[PDB]
Design a protein around this nucleic acid. Structure first.
Lengths: 68, 125, 11, 177, 37, 35, 306, 238
RNA sequence: GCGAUGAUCACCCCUUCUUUUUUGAAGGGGUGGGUACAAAUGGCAGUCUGACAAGU
């Protein structure tokens, strides 16, 4: 009902800190994400490929254009 | 020391092994997110905290940006890093096995009975 | 026969 | 008719009902009474099977497929009847052969103990300690709980001796035992 | 010949090689003693 | 033998024995320094 | 549901059904009444009937139908929302089967289950046969060596229950002449012991299960043959029913087998030898499961591989 | 990755009916409506709960575009427990099964497919899931299957056709409720491969606006897909 | 109102006040393991080669 008091608004705010603090443990450290991200890109780039897809767009774009 | 059949079988094992590992890994999203706003004054006052109804920490987490109302290990993370490398290791072996297989196929192809002028254009009867 | 064989591409 | 498999979980009941409701399309009030007679309407399955049969996603199977279901369901029904017949035979035979052991623990349990020993003569030759571990893998005789198990194993050993080494064993000693 | 082995295969092969070395050492030691006598 | 302890090969059961592996690891080492 | 499917199909095609025609006729008494129809196609079809109705189908009527479908469960007393969902679910599957040209005689999943069931029956019938031989072998242990067939063995028990009966009982329909006299000689000189009628009755009951199961096993074999000649008639003509059914079961579906190259079909049932040979630099198999095809049997020597 | 024997901690996602399985890696996860089986071979995470054994299925972003949307961080997903959903372009149960999991027993999913061969696979999966109503019909003529579909809360369209905007509008005009949900998967190449994907995405947003659908947010699906985006809009009849 | 026809014998969930004062008051569940059966489109696990062959 939006009857939140100053004291009530403090207890809930503490819960936000408490829950968010706990989820940081599952979030992991920033340093590992630096290496993990680099590994993720290397795995993704080879598996997804799409280098030909990037080239195909350029070829189709170049073909349609008038050349003088 | 090995034949073409042996190398082919190993590469196929890695390829299926790679798919199961890659499927089971999780990769963070990198796509662009855009929001459509009715009015310019609504645009200027927009902030990620209000739109998502989340705290600043959750805004950065696109995958699980929990609503604030809802809110109201070095060994462990190392095993994660080994694990992402382990998929990389399969990726490295697969290309290495592919290179060996390609060379084996070329040698057999050369041994094949042909004009081999580079092959001369000749219909095979 | 283990002596005959040699292991490669190890992780 | 996938729904009906849920409506009658009992395996024996389901087969008999399948014999009657071969095709779920056939639904009559008289047929409802007939299947209502099968088992009881207290569970309410009789009205459910009519309602579900009218609205279900089951794909109709060919007559030959249906002929195999009922025929196979008949084969299951025969075995269940024969199993009940054989069970009675085992109970009667145990009383004749091992009245003391059967009376002490039971016909089925006594028969399992005899088979584990390999024969009634083998069971009688064993010591009470060996008899106890003979049925310790299926918990045939099962700190105060263990004492009863050991006590019952000793009495079971004696009961087997009276049965094996008697030309016409009686149940008099098994009863007091 | 060059071959590619999994983890379990490698453990079995390592275990055998350990055993043969122990057996070779033990057999030689007995030989030297009886040779000395 | 318990079902989990049973293995298809005699070698695989032997590896399971913790006492055996400790002796092999110790005994394997001493031969190596001597070598 | 059969009526519902026919009625639904007419609606999809835009045709007026007899029930709808009968339903509209009942209201025919009201002169000059306007008919609102969701589809233009159905509206035109109703117009052709010559009924005294001005049929209207326009975009504005869509707002009307939206409200009705939103509140249809309340509009129709006596029917709950859940029951409408179930009737829609059952009808949808019926329509989907019709659209997909589903036929009860062209489902492979019966083949995969029948062949799996056929092997299960062979195993179980074998175990019951062994029990009968051991249990009845107590009475007359020499029969098993004489007659090896389980079905023939069980029939001898049914015809004659006790060795005494062997003198008068005739085994001509079960056994040849030379075998039937052998059992008669064995009966009198047997080492077995007598059994009671109570023991005999249950052994007869067990034997009756042997012949019934053998009878049904033949039925399942014929049933699978009928299935194979309707679901894959061309394959059966070439490889046969039994090997053809086994091929489908190994892949798990007819489509899964269809997408396989002919090389894989050659060695489909010899994966253990295939992958052992590939990893050890040794020659590979060349028949697999097709070795039991009739044509391969007719071949000899190296021609079997070809 | 998380091998068969690995242990994970399951915690709820921001969207109702979606879960995250914590451990060595997070995993996007949904509760299994039909436990004990997988529909396309996905790994299943199973947990004891008082003891009844509840099961969960892994949701692969690379196979499902809706899953890729959740990964990108979509603000709002109208697909939620106890809601009717109309799924257009249901090639098979790869993504419809997961949508069927999210809605739960109370909700229903209307899966629409045109091609016969994917359709038979869809029917086979639907038998396991009672809440899925398969419709083997062309989405370009929604009047054909109007009977089988009631009013729906949300519409999800994965149809890969150049004229998908027309298909979305026709289906929404008949079945989608006022203020309802609209989630569209757009592939730039199928519509117009000549021009950049950004131009196509802007072009589609305009067509939705003409059809009384108010766009709320747009999201590209990289790295899961290239030249794809998910557009989330609300159906404003008034 | 006993007994040789048999007694006995894995893990976790001093401080405050006060006193005629050396006196009074207060602070069953989950893990793990063993036996038998059933299911998994769960793992090992990867589906051989590819243009010549045969006759005068």
């Amino acid at each position: 009902e939006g009857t939140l008091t100053d004291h009530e608004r403090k207890y809930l705010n503490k819960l936000i800190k408490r829950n968010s603090q706990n989820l940081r443990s599952w979030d992991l450290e920033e340093e590992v994400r630096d290496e993990l991200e680099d590994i993720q890109q290397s795995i993704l780039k080879d598996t997804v490929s799409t280098a030909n897809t990037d080239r195909s767009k350029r070829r189709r774009f170049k073909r349609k254009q008038f050349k003088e | 020391t090995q034949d073409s059949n042996y190398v082919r079988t190993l590469r196929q094992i890695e390829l299926k092994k790679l798919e199961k590992g890659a499927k089971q890994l999780m990769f963070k999203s990198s796509g662009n997110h855009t929001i459509f706003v009715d009015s310019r004054e609504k645009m200027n006052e927009f902030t990620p905290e209000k739109f998502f109804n989340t705290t600043s920490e959750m805004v950065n987490r696109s995958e699980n940006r929990l609503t604030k109302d809802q809110l109201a290990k070095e060994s462990l993370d190392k095993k994660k890093l080994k694990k992402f490398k382990q998929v990389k290791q399969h990726l490295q072996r697969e290309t290495q096995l592919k290179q060996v297989q390609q060379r084996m196929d070329a040698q057999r192809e050369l041994l094949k009975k042909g004009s081999k002028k580079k092959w001369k254009k000749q219909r095979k009867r | 026969e283990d002596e005959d064989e040699e292991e490669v591409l190890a992780m | 008719f996938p729904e009906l498999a849920k409506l009658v979980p009992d395996n024996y009941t389901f087969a008999k009902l399948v014999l009657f409701i071969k095709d779920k399309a056939s639904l009559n009030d008289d047929s409802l009474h007939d299947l209502a007679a099968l088992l009881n309407e207290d569970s309410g399955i009789a009205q459910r099977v009519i309602d579900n049969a009218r609205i279900s996603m089951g794909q109709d199977i060919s007559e030959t497929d249906m002929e195999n279901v009922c025929v196979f369901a008949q084969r299951v029904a025969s075995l269940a009847d024969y199993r009940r017949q054989l069970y009675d035979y085992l109970c009667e035979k145990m009383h004749t052969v091992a009245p003391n052991l059967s009376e002490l623990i039971g016909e089925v349990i006594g028969a399992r103990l005899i088979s584990h020993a390999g024969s009634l003569t083998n069971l009688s030759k064993q010591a009470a300690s060996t008899v106890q571990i003979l049925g310790a893998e299926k918990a045939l005789f099962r700190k105060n709980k263990g004492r009863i198990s050991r006590y019952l194993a000793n009495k079971c050993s004696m009961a087997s001796r009276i049965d094996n080494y008697s030309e016409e064993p009686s149940n008099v000693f098994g009863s007091v035992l | 010949r060059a071959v590619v082995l999994g983890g379990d295969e490698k453990k079995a092969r390592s275990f055998i090689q350990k055993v043969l070395t122990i057996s070779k050492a033990k057999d030689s030691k007995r030989k030297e003693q009886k040779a000395s006598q | 033998m318990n079902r989990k302890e049973r293995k298809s090969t005699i070698l695989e059961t032997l590896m399971g024995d913790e006492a055996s592996n400790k002796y092999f690891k110790r005994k394997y080492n001493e031969i190596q320094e001597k070598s | 549901a059969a009526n519902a499917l026919e009625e639904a199909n007419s609606i999809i095609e835009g045709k007026v059904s007899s029930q709808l025609e009968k339903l509209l006729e009942e209201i025919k008494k009201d002169k000059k009444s306007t008919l609102i129809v969701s589809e233009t196609k159905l509206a035109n079809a109703i117009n052709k009937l010559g009924l005294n109705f001005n049929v209207v189908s326009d975009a504005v009527t869509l707002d009307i139908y939206r409200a009705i479908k939103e509140y249809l469960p309340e509009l129709l007393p006596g029917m709950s929302d859940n029951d409408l969902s179930k009737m829609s679910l059952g009808l949808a599957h019926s329509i989907g089967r019709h659209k997909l040209k589903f036929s009860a005689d062209k489902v492979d999943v019966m083949i995969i289950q029948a062949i799996a069931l056929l092997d299960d029956l062979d195993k179980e019938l074998n175990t019951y046969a062994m029990r009968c031989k051991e249990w009845y072998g107590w009475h007359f242990p020499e029969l098993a060596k004489i007659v090896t067939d389980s079905v023939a063995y069980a029939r001898i028990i049914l015809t004659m229950g006790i060795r005494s009966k062997a003198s008068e009982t005739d085994l001509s329909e079960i056994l040849p002449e030379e075998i039937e006299e052998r059992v008669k000689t064995a009966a009198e000189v047997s080492m077995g012991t007598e059994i009671t009628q109570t023991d005999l009755d249950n052994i007869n009951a067990l034997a009756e299960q042997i012949v019934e199961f053998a009878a049904y096993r033949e039925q399942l074999s014929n049933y699978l043959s009928a299935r194979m000649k309707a679901i894959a008639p061309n394959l059966t003509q070439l490889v046969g029913e039994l090997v053809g059914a086994r091929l489908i079961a190994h892949s798990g579906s007819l489509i899964s087998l269809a997408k396989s190259p002919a090389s894989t079909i050659q060695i489909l049932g010899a994966e253990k030898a295939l992958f052992r040979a590939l990893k050890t630099k040794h020659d590979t198999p060349k028949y697999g499961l097709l070795y039991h095809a009739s044509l391969v049997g007719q071949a000899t020597g190296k021609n079997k591989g070809k | 990755g998380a091998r068969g024997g690995a242990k994970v901690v399951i915690e709820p996602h921001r969207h109702a009916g979606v879960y995250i399985a914590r451990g060595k890696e997070d995993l996007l996860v949904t509760k299994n409506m039909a436990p004990g089986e997988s529909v396309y071979g996905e790994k299943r995470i199973s947990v004891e709960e008082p003891p009844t054994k509840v099961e969960y299925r892994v949701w692969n972003p690379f196979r499902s575009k809706l899953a890729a949307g959740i990964m990108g961080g979509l603000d709002e997903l109208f697909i939620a427990p106890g809601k009717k959903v109309l799924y257009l372009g249901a090639a098979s149960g790869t993504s419809v099964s997961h949508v069927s999991d999210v809605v739960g027993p109370e909700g229903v999913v209307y899966a629409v497919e045109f091609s016969h061969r994917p359709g038979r696979e869809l029917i086979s999966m639907a038998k396991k899931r009672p809440n899925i109503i398969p419709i083997i019909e062309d989405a370009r003529h929604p009047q054909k299957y109007r009977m089988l579909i009631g009013m729906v809360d949300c519409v999800f369209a994965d149809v890969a056709q150049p004229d998908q905007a027309r298909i979305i509008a026709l289906n929404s005009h008949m079945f989608l409720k006022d203020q309802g949900g609209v989630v569209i998967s757009i592939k730039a190449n199928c519509i117009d491969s000549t021009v950049d994907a950004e131009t196509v995405f802007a072009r589609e947003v305009q067509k939705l606006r003409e059809e009384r659908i108010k766009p709320l947010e747009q999201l590209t699906l990289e790295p899961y897909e290239r030249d794809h985006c998910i557009v989330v809009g609300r159906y404003m009849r008034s």
